[PDB]
Amino acid sequence: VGTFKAKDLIVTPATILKEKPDPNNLVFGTVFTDHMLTVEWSSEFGWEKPHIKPLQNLSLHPGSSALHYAVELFEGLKAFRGVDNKIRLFQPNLNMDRMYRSAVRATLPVFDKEELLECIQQLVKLDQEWVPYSTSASLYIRPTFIGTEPSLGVKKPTKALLFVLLSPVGPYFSSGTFNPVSLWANPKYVRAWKGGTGDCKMGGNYGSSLFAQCEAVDNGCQQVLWLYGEDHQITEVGTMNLFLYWINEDGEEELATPPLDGIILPGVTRRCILDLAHQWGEFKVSERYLTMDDLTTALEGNRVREMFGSGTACVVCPVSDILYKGETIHIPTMENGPKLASRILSKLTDIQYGREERDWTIVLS
């Protein structure tokens, strides 16, 4: 085992620069910056030197295991141009931890988390003018890791490529204010199972979700509510972690989210919201199982305050409605402020854009 080193970076700047888009007219993940990071690996020689070079097509053997047996994983973290014009990463160390653990589970080769993070900072620094001049826009960082073994054998790869893409993204919604979401709840589809890879950011987990999201849009919903088990546990809202703020069965004010039992992605936003909630010490915080019966029973009892999704995508996305067994079920999130959702959004946004300081942000090299 070894690692590529940031001190060995070979930088090939681009001679022609692309036009930056209007920060307002940004469609998520459609526009790419001038430069990418690439690092080759072989079982024979280990990691090659890391390269920052102009964005280009990858030349892959059509046998590459990434295209056949989804021998791939990715990450999603953001760079934010603060109110003081200082560019900040947000909990990037957690994204590096999660990516290392995903590589091990994918049988892709391990790397030094610190060396990758430093390589990423160099790339963001070179293309720093892509980090949008807007307090509601950001730069998406897409670390990607693929098996390039030119062999149809189902096996641990002996060649691989780790690359990083940068994409400027506008606010999750046109305005930037809350546009509450409708969820499609069909237990017929399942995102992840116990003993699967649901708790890793591996490409395989997402391919099977598209047909379901298409079926959500057909029934006039924005996202899928992923249900697990005989008693229909609410797990995740699309590609976001699920939070329920309510009066629990014991009459206690509670923030509830499904536990990490292997079918839940340990989101960085999920980690931050739980940390904040524990820290505030104002109500009970419970990593616990939630069913549609628990929710509908609490709704008839006027015990539900707010339900919202959390991820790098939206930060905090309130839920107004769930479509389940052919009826629309209203969640009174927007009727109750949404007081907690608003508070969380303010705190994370204030940190991301350096309106306050915290350990969760690192200023760019």
**Collapsed DSSP state (helix, strand, coil) of residue 187:** coil
Interacting residue with ligand UTE among 234, 313, 315, 351 (CB under 6 A):
313
Residue 244 phi/psi, 5-degree rounding, is -125, 120
CB nearer to its own copies: pick between 242 and 274: 242
Min CB(112)–Mg ion separation in Å: 4
CA distance 131 to 301: 47
- The answer to whether the beta carbons of residues 98 and 75 sit under 8 Å apart is yes
Q: Which two tokens stand for residue 54?
A: 């102009």
Going residue by residue from 338 to 357, which x/- string records binding to ligand UTE, judged by CB under 6 A? --------------------
Q: In DSSP terms, which residues pair with 87 in a beta bridge?
A: 81
Min CB(239)–ligand PLP separation in Å: 4
Going residue by residue from 269 to 308, which x/- string records binding to ligand UTE, judged by CB under 6 A? ----------------------------------------
Min CB(69)–ligand UTE separation in Å: 7
What is the binding site for ligand PLP (CB under 6 A)? 76, 201, 236, 239-241, 265, 267-270, 311-312
Min CB(309)–its own copies separation in Å: 14
Q: Largest alpha-carbon pair distance within the chain?
A: 65
Nearest CA to 267 among 218, 311, 331? 311
- The answer to whether the beta carbons of residues 246 and 298 sit under 8 Å apart is yes
Interacting residue with ligand UTE among 92, 170, 238, 338 (CB under 6 A):
238
Q: Which two tokens stand for residue 249?
A: 């069965």
Q: Does 169 help bind ligand UTE (rule: CB under 6 A)?
A: yes
Interacting residue with ligand UTE among 155, 278, 284, 330 (CB under 6 A):
155
CA distance 223 to 114: 35
Cα torsion angle, 103, 109, 112, 115, sign:
negative
CA distance 144 to 99: 9
* Chain residues 195-214 in contact with ligand UTE, contact rule CB under 6 A: 213
Min CB(226)–its own copies separation in Å: 10
198 Cβ contact partners less than 8 Å away, ≥ 6 residues apart:
191, 192, 205, 262, 263, 264, 265
- The radius of gyration of the chain from alpha carbons, rounded to an integer in Å, stands at 21
- The answer to whether the beta carbons of residues 138 and 77 sit under 8 Å apart is no
What is the binding site for its own copies (CB under 8 A)? 27-30, 32, 36, 55-63, 66-72, 74, 104-107, 140, 142, 144, 146, 150-156, 163, 165, 167, 187-190, 192-197, 202-211, 213-214, 238-239
CB nearer to Mg ion: pick between 117 and 313: 117
334 Cβ contact partners less than 8 Å away, ≥ 6 residues apart:
178, 180, 318, 320
> For 143-159, b where at least 16 C-beta lie within 10 A, e where not — what string?
bbbbbbbeeeeeeebbb
Min CB(28)–ligand UTE separation in Å: 4
* Chain residues 85-114 in contact with Mg ion, contact rule CB under 5 A: 112
Which does residue 112 bind out of Mg ion, ligand UTE, ligand PLP, none, counting CB within 5 to 8 angstroms by kind? Mg ion
Min CB(13)–its own copies separation in Å: 18
CB nearer to ligand PLP: pick between 269 and 333: 269
Q: How many residues bind ligand UTE (CB under 6 A)?
A: 17
Q: Does 154 help bind ligand UTE (rule: CB under 6 A)?
A: yes
Min CB(258)–ligand PLP separation in Å: 11
Q: Which two tokens stand for residue 126?
A: 């070179």
Chain positions contacting ligand UTE, by CB under 6 A: 28-29, 76, 140, 152-155, 169, 213, 222-223, 238-239, 311-313
Chain positions contacting Mg ion, by CB under 5 A: 112
